[PDB]
Design an enzyme around this catalytic site. Structure first.
Site, PDB file in Angstrom:
ATOM      1  N   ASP C  31       0.869  -1.177   0.000  1.00 20.92           N
ATOM      2  CA  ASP C  31       0.000   0.000   0.000  1.00 20.92           C
ATOM      3  C   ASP C  31       0.904   1.225   0.000  1.00 20.92           C
ATOM      4  O   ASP C  31       1.352   1.679   1.051  1.00 20.92           O
ATOM      5  CB  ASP C  31      -0.922  -0.010   1.209  1.00 20.92           C
ATOM      6  CG  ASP C  31      -1.869   1.181   1.232  1.00 20.92           C
ATOM      7  OD1 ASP C  31      -1.559   2.211   0.593  1.00 20.92           O
ATOM      8  OD2 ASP C  31      -2.925   1.089   1.894  1.00 20.92           O
ATOM      9  N   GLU C 123       1.263   1.416  13.374  1.00 20.49           N
ATOM     10  CA  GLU C 123       0.168   1.467  12.411  1.00 20.49           C
ATOM     11  C   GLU C 123      -0.923   0.558  12.962  1.00 20.49           C
ATOM     12  O   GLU C 123      -1.062  -0.601  12.541  1.00 20.49           O
ATOM     13  CB  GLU C 123       0.606   1.052  11.009  1.00 20.49           C
ATOM     14  CG  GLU C 123      -0.402   1.479   9.951  1.00 20.49           C
ATOM     15  CD  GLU C 123      -1.333   0.355   9.586  1.00 20.49           C
ATOM     16  OE1 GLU C 123      -0.911  -0.554   8.846  1.00 20.49           O
ATOM     17  OE2 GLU C 123      -2.469   0.348  10.101  1.00 20.49           O
ATOM     18  N   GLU C 132     -10.175  -4.292  15.061  1.00 27.58           N
ATOM     19  CA  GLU C 132      -8.998  -4.988  15.583  1.00 27.58           C
ATOM     20  C   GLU C 132      -8.663  -4.533  16.999  1.00 27.58           C
ATOM     21  O   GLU C 132      -7.988  -5.254  17.739  1.00 27.58           O
ATOM     22  CB  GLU C 132      -7.781  -4.799  14.674  1.00 27.58           C
ATOM     23  CG  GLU C 132      -7.950  -5.397  13.291  1.00 27.58           C
ATOM     24  CD  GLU C 132      -6.744  -5.159  12.402  1.00 27.58           C
ATOM     25  OE1 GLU C 132      -5.615  -5.484  12.829  1.00 27.58           O
ATOM     26  OE2 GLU C 132      -6.925  -4.646  11.278  1.00 27.58           O
ATOM     27  N   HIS C 280      -5.554   0.289   1.249  1.00 33.76           N
ATOM     28  CA  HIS C 280      -6.100  -1.030   1.555  1.00 33.76           C
ATOM     29  C   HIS C 280      -7.208  -0.964   2.597  1.00 33.76           C
ATOM     30  O   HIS C 280      -7.855  -1.985   2.850  1.00 33.76           O
ATOM     31  CB  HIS C 280      -4.974  -1.979   2.002  1.00 33.76           C
ATOM     32  CG  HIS C 280      -4.544  -1.797   3.424  1.00 33.76           C
ATOM     33  ND1 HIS C 280      -3.763  -0.739   3.841  1.00 33.76           N
ATOM     34  CD2 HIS C 280      -4.778  -2.548   4.527  1.00 33.76           C
ATOM     35  CE1 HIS C 280      -3.543  -0.843   5.140  1.00 33.76           C
ATOM     36  NE2 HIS C 280      -4.146  -1.932   5.581  1.00 33.76           N
TER      37      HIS C 280
HETATM   38  N1  LIG Z   1      -1.283  -6.418  21.309  1.00 29.36           N
HETATM   39  C1  LIG Z   1      -0.321  -6.479  20.396  1.00 29.36           C
HETATM   40  N2  LIG Z   1       0.993  -6.546  20.787  1.00 29.36           N
HETATM   41  C2  LIG Z   1       2.003  -6.611  19.850  1.00 29.36           C
HETATM   42  N3  LIG Z   1       1.695  -6.607  18.506  1.00 29.36           N
HETATM   43  C3  LIG Z   1       0.402  -6.539  18.114  1.00 29.36           C
HETATM   44  C4  LIG Z   1      -0.625  -6.474  19.040  1.00 29.36           C
HETATM   45  N4  LIG Z   1      -1.792  -6.416  18.359  1.00 29.36           N
HETATM   46  C5  LIG Z   1      -1.524  -6.441  17.034  1.00 29.36           C
HETATM   47  N5  LIG Z   1      -0.171  -6.520  16.872  1.00 29.36           N
HETATM   48  C6  LIG Z   1       0.601  -6.577  15.630  1.00 29.36           C
HETATM   49  O1  LIG Z   1       0.612  -5.291  15.030  1.00 29.36           O
HETATM   50  C7  LIG Z   1       0.799  -5.416  13.627  1.00 29.36           C
HETATM   51  C8  LIG Z   1      -0.108  -4.437  12.896  1.00 29.36           C
HETATM   52  S1  LIG Z   1      -0.122  -4.566  11.083  1.00 29.36           S
HETATM   53  C9  LIG Z   1       1.663  -4.446  10.803  1.00 29.36           C
HETATM   54  C10 LIG Z   1       2.181  -3.021  10.914  1.00 29.36           C
HETATM   55  C11 LIG Z   1       3.662  -2.909  10.589  1.00 29.36           C
HETATM   56  N6  LIG Z   1       4.261  -1.810  11.330  1.00 29.36           N
HETATM   57  C12 LIG Z   1       3.850  -2.723   9.085  1.00 29.36           C
HETATM   58  O2  LIG Z   1       3.730  -1.607   8.577  1.00 29.36           O
HETATM   59  O3  LIG Z   1       4.128  -3.671   8.344  1.00 29.36           O
HETATM   60  C13 LIG Z   1       0.526  -6.876  13.279  1.00 29.36           C
HETATM   61  O4  LIG Z   1       1.716  -7.469  12.819  1.00 29.36           O
HETATM   62  C14 LIG Z   1       0.073  -7.544  14.575  1.00 29.36           C
HETATM   63  O5  LIG Z   1       0.604  -8.830  14.696  1.00 29.36           O
END
Ligand SMILES: Nc1ncnc2c1ncn2[C@@H]1O[C@H](CSCC[C@H](N)C(=O)O)[C@@H](O)[C@H]1O
Ligand SMILES: Nc1ncnc2c1ncn2[C@@H]1O[C@H](CSCC[C@H](N)C(=O)O)[C@@H](O)[C@H]1O
Ligand SMILES: *C/C=C/[C@H]1O[C@@H](n2cnc3c(N)ncnc32)[C@H](O)[C@@H]1O
Ligand SMILES: *C/C=C/[C@H]1O[C@@H](n2cnc3c(N)ncnc32)[C@H](O)[C@@H]1O
Lengths: 12, 364, 342, 343, 364, 12
Positions: C31, C123, C132, C280
């Site tokens: 994206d 993010e 989420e 996205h």
């Molecule tokens: N409670 C939590 N503790 C640690 N990671 C978490 C979480 N809840 C969600 N995540 C993680 O946060 C991410 C968000 S999407 C990935 C974002 C990443 N910075 C990028 O740009 O590629 C996911 O990989 C998910 O596994």
């Protein structure tokens, strides 16, 4: 997973 | 319970939640081949239902029980573990059949029937037949079947055939090559390209295709539901010896399945073959990690081994070799996480299938 | 732990399994609006990162930690709960950044950091912003933030506006009316049509649309990440008073969001608006089971109420009325299970 | 009288008031297919009229009587129950045919003809042929017909065929769904949605369409006016078995009709088919409240039952099912109150 | 009964059959000006309904009674003579208002109310206001009104104004000239041409128009429903003295009507004027058999006489003359048999209305 | 008669 979200696939 | 023992709770929660949706019932019901064939199998074998006691395993909306009721069943026990059991009850009352259809919410491994039945009906087929592991619930239900009782469907045939599809194979590396980049926004991603390749190759492909990509007649592995037991499906070994009808690169194995309703009047078949009209099961293809060259006349031998897991699916292990040259390949796939590749177009035939000049046939 | 308390176990397994797949990281990374906007916001505000200690909440592949490193950070703690932490570690080593990026596997609610940080990056935006429930993990991480620390993104604005889309409404209505048939293969389904309508319209619709279908200027609900507490997101009340700019049928409310990176050098915005290039996240539309008729100049008023649930999403309650006529529409939607129409 | 017995008074008043307006006579007369076909059928069969005694049932302006006079008729009794009979008399005088055309005001069931006739002419067809129930008056007039007498038209063929038209269905369905709203100005109307659907789909739709929307060859029901009785049209049972030629949703049945003038010289046909030039009858379509899905090769079977009512029309009952699936549709329509859709 | 005496059976049968159709209720309910104005008039005058007893004459689907209930009425008696009374009862039950709205099937002239009411509401206006003669049923219902009770609507204003419309007038003869041909399939039709002309001129025209076709400020005839008696509407004499604002050929008289809801808090106006948004009443125009030439400043004087008939309508007699010249014209029309001429187009203004160059005003 | 058929006119 795709099968955990959709065990049966969509048919038009 | 037998179900809880073999199933992880996380899988069961998402599984039965999915089937609690009316939209998913509609998708299945609107599959004309699937719903019409079940109706024809039941109504045309009316003697198998007239004044009989019936069990419907995983009745969903109860549609199969209404067919059995249309055929003359005296009593039908409709078991459903999802929340769809409530909607099935609403339909039983609205259709004035409360005296003849009893909806039992819960898993067929955990409910109690007041009596034994003459015939069991169900639609327990997942894609590649065995996914969801509902066939084991279907066989488990035979504890309620009378000695002389029948099963609708009665047998299932899984078909395997080697296919050639250069584009499907090459697509796995085109997708993985996203990571083969030295400066994605300044980050070198190339160290993960091999992991991306491994991830895609663990996915079976749920798709349809032109039958001309198949390079040999299929081998069939048959499950007789009247005779098979639950444990027979825990480990499914499917040996194959394919007599190559065409020469080329074999990129994997294609899967489909048929079921037969062996009734007293006639036998009715429901087929998901690529030569038949498309169903919501489509077909399934598992790639080899490396293609195998085979000549016409060679034999491609090996094994497809399906090992059931606690996520209501199977770990797939394929090993194949061309006997005449010893070339071997293998792959390990997760049947629960396929890639849904269907697009809606007509599947194109493999190149080099024209044996007469297409230009001479423009004005046939 | 705070996470396990508010999250059902089956939902967490599927959630983090999803983010363990490299294909799902590729989808987000590719994206270009999202990834390029994040990089530009960080590099342009390099003073907010130069020689700073950083926390990257949910780093996934680590892409954002690499941006903070490019901006001059001294140390970056990249917390990731999925198995993607393994792959992120591989990238840290292969890029020779072991001295600056420390991957910490686990949930940000459960790990231990050796020190406090100057700035948090993440993010955590789902579709319609709040899906989420990762915004609460992002806010929970402030327990590691120094008193005057910053957060990237700094604020989030959710926009809602009424829309007219007869085609969308009839698609969903026609699907549900499958259960109106009195003789499907001889079976009367009609007693379930109400349940069908309730189910189908419980699904928010994720796709894009043109601004011309909007019938009033949007209202905005702002979450200030610097000030907000994670408890603030358990129940989100969004009152709205729409001044209708066009006459016609209001078929529901459309949703989208912007986030701002308020840096010391400049403020950078990331927008998912229907007037901006597609991301996205697309946009999100909640349909009324029956549309409301409105005249230009009327006021459509009501409340959009988001109640967080244990499946890492929200149960959405939208009550709206045309004040001049008293026509009311009430709807309940499951943000976790949208219909992807694109 | 036979007419008063089978007709409610409030329906007859309105009925004959309608046909007293010259504008309505103009509407029928200007239908060139109808009027031109009647004329050619009469003139080309001039031997059936030469020096014969003719009865014109419901002559209106008298146009058909003038055609019979053109063919050489010796005497024509033009019966008309509306006040149009006075205008017809004016035309008979102004065309100098008082010696050959005798206008007799009143209902053909309540009047007295001085003698028997060799041939009866009439235009008694309504929408879907049977509306207005004038066919029974046409048959009733056979009391005055000579044993060897003829009838113009001689036979009538009503055709049925299943159609698919998602646009038409959704128009009528959307209108009825007005009554699904839960808060019309704050009032919940939803309890009447079922009643609304019943009302809107009780209306047959009068307009034209392309043959492409038909999903099977038509089925034909024939009324032979030479040998049929008045009572034969009180209850009309039309069984059908359609072999589907295309797959899709059957939204209802389409109706049209042909009549044949079986003269001594030749037979002439007047058709309201959707493949023929448009007439003021158009075509008629009865919608199912819920369409039936059928596959090519399937059979759509059932019965269309018309029960005459005292409002000079029929209560239509259409029951159809897809044999291969048992999917059934049952509908009741009021032929008197159609929806005129032609824009 | 008072109704049966003044109404022929055949007319009443057609009349109440029409109003039994839900589609006809929808048509009226979807007239936003009509339904919206009634709702505002009632809700904004809530003191006239709060804890009051209400009579709804010809309630149809009951919509006006629901508005009274929204305003706080204690009891509402909804009288309806068509079979729509059944559907209204269903709506009262489904809306959980059986304790506050009592549907009484039958004619307001023949039913019995258990008590007297504080306010009567109704929608008794037909096109040209008086058609259908329901105003008399509305006035008849005052036998149930308490001495100081109110009526919604309270007064009605019929407006008359002379118009010029050469196209409308000429169209009458174009239509009738169908009969002016000597060989229609060999038949001379000309002897009926005069009868055809007569038939068309007896029809009022229901459609809309641009107000610039009006040649003089309107004249207003007011009915005060609080004071008027049934018999006042049997013979309605409307004298007029129009002072021409424009010179041209006067082709007839245009009619529209407004009603006023005089409440304790405010008076709400419902207008069907050509200057207001279109309603399902449109406007009504009656042609003169012969056009009258008038010049600006002249006076067009005459009488519009409405004589009620037993078909729930009126026989219209219009006479007018240009005083300065003595040129007179007349016409007799059947209000029950109007010609619905509305096409859906925006009405065009009379030619010769541009006082500046239209070419100079292109681009503005 | 148009009035006997439709006392009230249709508004699109
Ligand atoms: N409670 C939590 N503790 C640690 N990671 C978490 C979480 N809840 C969600 N995540 C993680 O946060 C991410 C968000 S999407 C990935 C974002 C990443 N910075 C990028 O740009 O590629 C996911 O990989 C998910 O596994
Ligand atoms: N029972 C009856 N007796 C006499 N006339 C009748 C009748 N029923 C209907 N009619 C008349 O028959 C006419 C049918 S329309 C046909 C008019 C004329 N024959 C033509 O072809 O142009 C109507 O004018 C109607 O008034
Ligand atoms: C493929 C369709 C499956 C249907 O059967 C239901 N189902 C699955 N597993 C069970 C058990 N163990 N008991 C009852 N019903 C079951 C699915 O919910 C679906 O409707
Ligand atoms: C414009 C029509 C309004 C409604 O009033 C009804 N109606 C007319 N006349 C009567 C009488 N005398 N009693 C009761 N209701 C009446 C019409 O049916 C229509 O719904």
């Amino acid at each position: 997973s795709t099968g955990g979200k959709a065990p049966r696939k969509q048919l038009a | 319970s037998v179900f809880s023992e073999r199933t992880e709770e996380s899988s069961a929660v998402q599984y039965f939640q999915f089937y609690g949706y009316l939209s998913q019932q509609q998708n299945m019901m609107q599959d004309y081949v699937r719903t019409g064939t079940y109706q024809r199998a039941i109504l045309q074998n009316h003697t198998d239902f007239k004044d009989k006691i019936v069990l419907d395993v995983g009745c969903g909306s109860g549609i199969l029980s209404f067919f059995a009721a249309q055929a003359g069943a005296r009593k039908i026990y409709a078991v459903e573990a999802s929340t769809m059991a409530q909607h099935a009850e609403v339909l039983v009352k609205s259709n004035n059949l409360t005296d003849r259809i009893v909806v039992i919410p819960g898993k067929v491994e955990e409910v109690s029937l007041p009596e034994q039945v003459d015939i069991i009906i169900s639609e327990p087929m997942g894609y590649m037949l065995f996914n969801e592991r509902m066939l084991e619930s279907y066989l488990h239900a035979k504890k309620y079947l009378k000695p002389s009782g029948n099963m609708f469907p009665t047998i299932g045939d899984v078909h395997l055939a080697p296919f050639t599809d250069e584009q499907l194979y090459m697509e796995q590396f085109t997708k993985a090559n996203f990571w083969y980049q030295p400066s994605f926004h300044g980050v070198d991603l190339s160290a993960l390209r091999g992991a991306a390749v491994d991830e895609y190759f663990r996915q079976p492909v749920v798709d349809t295709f032109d039958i001309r990509i198949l390079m040999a007649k299929s081998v069939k592995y048959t499950v007789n539901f009247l005779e098979a037991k639950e444990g027979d499906l825990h480990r499914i070994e499917i040996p194959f010896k394919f007599h190559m009808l065409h020469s080329g690169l074999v990129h994997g194995l294609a899967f489909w399945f048929d079921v037969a309703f062996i009734g007293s009047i006639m036998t009715v078949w429901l087929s998901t073959a690529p030569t038949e009209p498309l169903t919501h099961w489509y077909q399934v293809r598992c790639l080899f990690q490396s293609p195998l060259f085979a000549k016409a006349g060679d034999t491609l031998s090996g094994t497809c081994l399906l090992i059931a897991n606690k996520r209501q699916s199977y770990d797939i292990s394929i090993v194949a070799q061309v006997d005449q040259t010893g070339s071997k390949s293998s792959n390990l796939l997760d049947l629960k996480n396929p890639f849904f590749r269907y697009t809606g177009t007509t599947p194109s035939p493999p190149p080099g299938s024209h044996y007469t000049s297409p230009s001479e046939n423009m004005w046939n």
